[PDB]
């Protein structure tokens, strides 16, 4: 079995959907055509999903870059060819990107440490074009409007008052949203020859937390739509390996 | 309630025992005199422990620095005065520190990113003396031999072959062991005026993974002893606030 | 007029093709349907191209990031909406990417300085999806095989023997090719809300310069094909603004 | 003889008290039971102290990290097992830590360069627990109140107005005091398997130098008390090797 | 021939005058006693100048550090012993250094990337004394007042509003002027055992661009004087090798 | 009085000769025409020298950058206009620069920390031309051969085996010699509008310490010659202010 995911090597499928919360895996599996529970160790919950005639895993990665890298590395080392992250994020453009909007991301800010322990900082955190295109084409089929943009993947959720957060700089640089894992996924994927992407639902705006605008309200219909897009994309991408 | 731990603010006790695996919380609570299950959200499982006449929380932090910082910040922001981490680690001194040995750590290598987003790199990751002394005195009472030393807290579990891992440098520098969260705990604690410490059980040696010497075997009697020391210390420290 | 390009502000078109060598501008204009010479100052030669019913500039940027940034900034500040770089590059994968092969790049290594004087290093150098897709679809129409991949954009052409070149690290990281300007273009474009891309012809392999495998032979038919793809893409993208 | 200290190798004792000013060595020796003058070269004055039945050296290190490292390295290379620094420092918490207060430090900010030329910045500057405990227990025996905390060891005494001093950041981070050598001592000690500590007398507050609150007044009774604590600790620690 | 300069190796003279603009080479050659056009490739224009009985090349380097390094390396690799840059620059001391003033520079700020890819940042960008002395003595002979000082060689011409430009810091540090290539020249020269210098004409002040005080007016008589000084110096230095 | 030098402000002369060892001040004063002892505090010994009709101070700075900066700042803040350092150094070119050779330095490697706490790393550590010229012209008058070159000013005297020393890199970069203070002097001088220089006697070669080639033998006649050159230069420079 995989060292920490505890799934057997034979159970790794070419396409894998990753999400942060183990609870979310259980909410996703029930919208599929069927599923098989595989393993649950620590924050890493794994389920084989069957959807639109195809088979792909759904696996939880936990909160944050160092914990997710364990997950991503084990998947890449054991046969995953495509990894899509579906997650939540905060808006960095509060005039234009609002609660419940959906972002399909192509690139990310490497505000982690593990990516830098693997490759020099100059190297880009970028997703695969094809995966990105597939996500966007599924959103278009379902008539679900989306945003595209760069995510800031930051290891600091709660800022302090000594070293300024770089969020406002990145907003000024036209980064769309903020989350905690996509850059890490993208860099590990490039290093390991695994295609990656990301789709995110907006939940709040960090620049408006002092007015209670937190990440505490996933708009249920929007969340459903994102999950449909994510599952759709997985199934289409899975067709090529099947 | 706490934003992500989902425990009420009134339920935060002055002493908190933190561990990585939510499963471990359930294995610890049953050795206490009694417990009350509080919350379980994502990888964060919280239980109020009653032991030796005192009351303290036990909370899981997940794998890795960015995820644990969410936990630690919420505890520090909402009344925790003392936080002890009990965890596993890898030996960096394989001639002297073997499987199942126990290390009580006073300081850590800041091979994360969140600590650096809070305070300049020059700042030390150090535990509180008193907590460290309390842990050591509990180990002495129970006649459990221990090691003391510095932990390397690294965000990279799986190294690649491009950028060398710094583990061998840190071994040469006399770091004892390697894990993934203690530096983060220590720096947040200093910033927030919360006393911190760490006790760790050795599980393998990264320098001998090519010969199967992994972190996959917690020596059961040694693990029990460490948990007894950790609970003992918590109860003693809790007496001062009670 | 533009401060250093010396073209009038009214002459900036929404799509601009950029190339390094002022000589190349003169070789490109003659394959268009017609052209108007605009300005030539320093290494910056500007010509208005007419191709497939559309109008776009072709402008030389010179060798290297700091010099090209002057060009790119003036174009972005004065109305350019899309900038495609067509250039030469060296292979970083000599088993697979050979002389005369064509690469359509989506992202780049920021081994410059100007990008870092504009935005933190963690920020990705990424092209626009749409531009990348347009280039690839033009190559497919013309039946011209291409490679896709990340470019290392390095400010050092001639390495010395004291500080190792990072080319081999980036090859190991799966970077495809090496050139000198694309990262700079990409970052300025993101900062300025200008869509960017890159198409490159392989000319040699730096890892085989000790055996004379230099950047001194642009395969003439391959160069023609790349230029056709680049012009094709420009014309298609120009249609949206016209 | 030692290369720069000029003391013979046979004269190095297991415990060594270090101080900045060669003049201070002469003021310390006369409070001991007896002494033997050993060497005086450059700013490095060495005297063998006899106190409470034990024998330990007292050696001056000069002002600043690079000069003190020469001293510390020679002592560590030639048999020193324990090194305590006794020095002066500035308050970083002027509401709570006043002129003449005494701080027993456990850790330090590495705002030097030599420590970084020996080991990566992430590594902590931490003292030995036992030494720290011994100092604190001697202060308690003598009924001398003390502070405990982190020292900022900075190579810049006189700030200029271009690059902000980091003192206010470190004050906000709960650093207690500022001096110039302790981090250097601590890191060399960890690297060389030598136990280290630090005791410091407060002399001024850098944040109030514009109002004349300089380091120009060592409160004589407080200085005596600190020196008594330092000598006491040395003698107790020396007992273990004797 | 030289790889990118396209001049033959036999045509490299011991002294070389370098300038940014290929147009400037043509304006310089006509003030010499005679000249021979050698090559023009990309932005690199080369002419053999005959002046005061001596022979030296004049070669254009283009805008910016990465492009100029190609030029400088090829000259240093193929026999150049002395390289003087004559260029334009911006004032960083607008009270004292005005439009058209002439600066003979001895050292430079390394705000590039190629110098850092060749040697650690701590290493100084410094010119040769002798070259500097020769320039100053030629200015004195011709009765042309000059300034001496440090140049900031920055790869960013157009600053943005996210990361502050360091120009004001360097002004406060007593840097005289700003340009884009001298540091690069100086470091390559030291690495290659080639003597270097720099003479610059002031054209504007970046701190007053918001009031139109741009680099768009080379005072014609002052420019003539600088070029006379530069040619004078070249001829004197050339005498030693002839 | 000066805060730490303890000399009165009225006693600061426009030219100051600085040396590391307080003992050396006493050996220099006796070769002057006469002297007046001024102050001796810590490692800082100050004497007013009278030589060739002029008056200048000689002041000891101690070992290392952070300690010397206190000295240099106080001199620059209180009227010093010219500061020459005379010191010892190690050869980085053992084939060409031998024991007892004399180097007159124009620039330095900033391998300290205080310079970086005052100004960005890109800024050069360079001496004043005039001072350098004066030193060289005094050596020529006295028929004393000298070397000129860049000094590596490093805060680490005793390297360890974890992080490689940069000495060999700097040797390859054509640095001549190694010492511990000149860069610091040069940067403080530029910041404070004080002219600086450096003259150094070679004592050993760090690359040959494993064969006993230490800094433990100042060739007495060569040392005399250097001191004569240094005093000569001071007197000439002092004439301009007198
Ligand atoms: C327990 C942690 C959770 C908190 N937020 C939702 C999912 C988990 C990670 C995080 C997310 O990255 C995110 C969403 C929305 N707004 C955010 C704002 C800031 C941010 O900083 C890293 C992360 C945000
Ligand atoms: C799913 C992750 C787990 C893997 N190891 C056990 C607990 C979790 C974190 C990690 C631990 O830090 C650790 C223990 C033992 N040897 C290790 C060796 C290397 C190491 O690198 C960060 C971490 C080690
Ligand atoms: C005068 C400079 C030219 C030299 N090469 C061709 C175009 C200009 C820039 C460079 C190009 O980036 C490139 C092409 C092919 N192989 C290369 C290998 C190394 C490289 O390093 C920056 C650049 C390469
Ligand atoms: C000649 C130098 C002396 C000056 N101060 C007293 C002892 C020597 C070092 C320094 C000390 O670290 C110190 C004490 C008190 N207040 C300080 C404030 C600032 C500081 O910055 C490094 C050092 C301070
Ligand atoms: C096309 C580029 C040109 C623009 N300026 C004149 C010559 C070329 C380079 C630059 C010069 O370095 C310079 C001169 C005057 N003022 C300047 C102000 C700022 C500056 O920033 C690098 C460069 C300046
Ligand atoms: C107590 C310290 C002394 C030791 N050496 C002589 C004077 C003082 C400083 C040092 C000098 O910088 C120096 C001279 C000769 N060879 C050296 C080799 C290495 C070096 O590293 C900083 C310094 C050297």
PDB file of N, CA and C and ligand atoms in Angstrom, chain C residues 4 42 44 70, chain E residues 63 85 88-91 154-157 167 178-181 203-204 206 209 215, ligand 5:
ATOM      1  N   UNK C   4      10.911  55.723 -26.111  1.00  0.00           N
ATOM      2  CA  UNK C   4      12.066  55.034 -26.732  1.00  0.00           C
ATOM      3  C   UNK C   4      11.770  54.244 -28.008  1.00  0.00           C
ATOM      4  N   UNK C  42      17.594  52.826 -31.847  1.00  0.00           N
ATOM      5  CA  UNK C  42      18.419  51.862 -31.109  1.00  0.00           C
ATOM      6  C   UNK C  42      18.173  50.476 -31.707  1.00  0.00           C
ATOM      7  N   UNK C  44      15.309  48.933 -31.460  1.00  0.00           N
ATOM      8  CA  UNK C  44      13.854  48.840 -31.553  1.00  0.00           C
ATOM      9  C   UNK C  44      13.321  49.294 -32.966  1.00  0.00           C
ATOM     10  N   UNK C  70      11.812  47.640 -21.589  1.00  0.00           N
ATOM     11  CA  UNK C  70      11.524  49.031 -22.033  1.00  0.00           C
ATOM     12  C   UNK C  70      10.469  48.977 -23.160  1.00  0.00           C
TER      13      UNK C  70
ATOM     14  N   UNK E  63      20.584  48.181 -25.050  1.00  0.00           N
ATOM     15  CA  UNK E  63      20.027  48.480 -23.776  1.00  0.00           C
ATOM     16  C   UNK E  63      19.953  47.274 -22.866  1.00  0.00           C
ATOM     17  N   UNK E  85      33.085  52.126 -20.981  1.00  0.00           N
ATOM     18  CA  UNK E  85      31.750  52.466 -21.366  1.00  0.00           C
ATOM     19  C   UNK E  85      31.510  53.966 -21.346  1.00  0.00           C
ATOM     20  N   UNK E  88      24.783  57.420 -21.210  1.00  0.00           N
ATOM     21  CA  UNK E  88      23.984  58.424 -20.571  1.00  0.00           C
ATOM     22  C   UNK E  88      23.502  57.889 -19.222  1.00  0.00           C
ATOM     23  N   UNK E  89      22.997  58.779 -18.362  1.00  0.00           N
ATOM     24  CA  UNK E  89      22.558  58.347 -17.041  1.00  0.00           C
ATOM     25  C   UNK E  89      21.605  59.417 -16.519  1.00  0.00           C
ATOM     26  N   UNK E  90      20.932  59.073 -15.415  1.00  0.00           N
ATOM     27  CA  UNK E  90      20.015  59.973 -14.760  1.00  0.00           C
ATOM     28  C   UNK E  90      20.618  60.468 -13.473  1.00  0.00           C
ATOM     29  N   UNK E  91      20.304  61.719 -13.052  1.00  0.00           N
ATOM     30  CA  UNK E  91      20.889  62.197 -11.797  1.00  0.00           C
ATOM     31  C   UNK E  91      20.143  61.625 -10.608  1.00  0.00           C
ATOM     32  N   UNK E 154      20.615  49.639 -12.840  1.00  0.00           N
ATOM     33  CA  UNK E 154      19.343  48.955 -12.581  1.00  0.00           C
ATOM     34  C   UNK E 154      18.726  48.387 -13.847  1.00  0.00           C
ATOM     35  N   UNK E 155      18.256  47.162 -13.759  1.00  0.00           N
ATOM     36  CA  UNK E 155      17.530  46.523 -14.861  1.00  0.00           C
ATOM     37  C   UNK E 155      16.105  47.018 -15.027  1.00  0.00           C
ATOM     38  N   UNK E 156      15.599  47.844 -14.096  1.00  0.00           N
ATOM     39  CA  UNK E 156      14.224  48.355 -14.247  1.00  0.00           C
ATOM     40  C   UNK E 156      14.247  49.880 -14.584  1.00  0.00           C
ATOM     41  N   UNK E 157      13.835  50.169 -15.806  1.00  0.00           N
ATOM     42  CA  UNK E 157      13.698  51.557 -16.285  1.00  0.00           C
ATOM     43  C   UNK E 157      12.377  52.126 -15.869  1.00  0.00           C
ATOM     44  N   UNK E 167      15.803  53.541  -5.933  1.00  0.00           N
ATOM     45  CA  UNK E 167      16.563  54.731  -6.337  1.00  0.00           C
ATOM     46  C   UNK E 167      16.707  55.734  -5.189  1.00  0.00           C
ATOM     47  N   UNK E 178      22.219  57.054 -12.165  1.00  0.00           N
ATOM     48  CA  UNK E 178      21.564  55.760 -12.494  1.00  0.00           C
ATOM     49  C   UNK E 178      21.716  55.481 -13.987  1.00  0.00           C
ATOM     50  N   UNK E 179      22.086  54.255 -14.317  1.00  0.00           N
ATOM     51  CA  UNK E 179      22.104  53.801 -15.695  1.00  0.00           C
ATOM     52  C   UNK E 179      21.800  52.266 -15.714  1.00  0.00           C
ATOM     53  N   UNK E 180      22.258  51.527 -16.738  1.00  0.00           N
ATOM     54  CA  UNK E 180      21.751  50.161 -16.851  1.00  0.00           C
ATOM     55  C   UNK E 180      22.812  49.112 -17.120  1.00  0.00           C
ATOM     56  N   UNK E 181      24.057  49.489 -17.300  1.00  0.00           N
ATOM     57  CA  UNK E 181      25.086  48.484 -17.699  1.00  0.00           C
ATOM     58  C   UNK E 181      26.431  48.464 -16.987  1.00  0.00           C
ATOM     59  N   UNK E 203      21.281  63.066 -18.267  1.00  0.00           N
ATOM     60  CA  UNK E 203      20.123  63.328 -19.080  1.00  0.00           C
ATOM     61  C   UNK E 203      18.870  63.154 -18.219  1.00  0.00           C
ATOM     62  N   UNK E 204      18.482  64.195 -17.495  1.00  0.00           N
ATOM     63  CA  UNK E 204      17.320  64.060 -16.709  1.00  0.00           C
ATOM     64  C   UNK E 204      17.586  63.520 -15.286  1.00  0.00           C
ATOM     65  N   UNK E 206      15.314  60.888 -12.712  1.00  0.00           N
ATOM     66  CA  UNK E 206      14.144  60.086 -12.526  1.00  0.00           C
ATOM     67  C   UNK E 206      13.134  60.593 -11.442  1.00  0.00           C
ATOM     68  N   UNK E 209      10.661  62.936 -13.292  1.00  0.00           N
ATOM     69  CA  UNK E 209       9.955  62.583 -14.499  1.00  0.00           C
ATOM     70  C   UNK E 209       8.473  63.029 -14.504  1.00  0.00           C
ATOM     71  N   UNK E 215      14.973  61.587 -19.858  1.00  0.00           N
ATOM     72  CA  UNK E 215      16.206  61.393 -20.536  1.00  0.00           C
ATOM     73  C   UNK E 215      15.934  61.545 -22.039  1.00  0.00           C
TER      74      UNK E 215
HETATM   75  C1  LIG G   5      15.986  52.881 -24.257  1.00  0.00           C
HETATM   76  C2  LIG G   5      16.598  53.064 -23.123  1.00  0.00           C
HETATM   77  C3  LIG G   5      17.417  54.286 -22.765  1.00  0.00           C
HETATM   78  C4  LIG G   5      16.814  55.071 -21.561  1.00  0.00           C
HETATM   79  N1  LIG G   5      17.850  55.737 -20.753  1.00  0.00           N
HETATM   80  C5  LIG G   5      18.817  56.369 -21.679  1.00  0.00           C
HETATM   81  C6  LIG G   5      19.645  55.289 -22.440  1.00  0.00           C
HETATM   82  C7  LIG G   5      18.874  53.978 -22.386  1.00  0.00           C
HETATM   83  C8  LIG G   5      18.948  53.465 -20.929  1.00  0.00           C
HETATM   84  C9  LIG G   5      18.547  54.628 -19.978  1.00  0.00           C
HETATM   85  C10 LIG G   5      19.707  55.151 -19.077  1.00  0.00           C
HETATM   86  O1  LIG G   5      20.251  54.074 -18.311  1.00  0.00           O
HETATM   87  C11 LIG G   5      19.169  56.289 -18.188  1.00  0.00           C
HETATM   88  C12 LIG G   5      19.454  57.575 -18.548  1.00  0.00           C
HETATM   89  C13 LIG G   5      18.833  58.642 -17.880  1.00  0.00           C
HETATM   90  N2  LIG G   5      17.965  58.487 -16.889  1.00  0.00           N
HETATM   91  C14 LIG G   5      17.666  57.220 -16.485  1.00  0.00           C
HETATM   92  C15 LIG G   5      16.784  57.060 -15.409  1.00  0.00           C
HETATM   93  C16 LIG G   5      16.460  55.816 -14.960  1.00  0.00           C
HETATM   94  C17 LIG G   5      17.132  54.678 -15.490  1.00  0.00           C
HETATM   95  O2  LIG G   5      16.699  53.533 -14.897  1.00  0.00           O
HETATM   96  C18 LIG G   5      17.400  52.318 -15.235  1.00  0.00           C
HETATM   97  C19 LIG G   5      17.925  54.793 -16.602  1.00  0.00           C
HETATM   98  C20 LIG G   5      18.258  56.075 -17.094  1.00  0.00           C
END
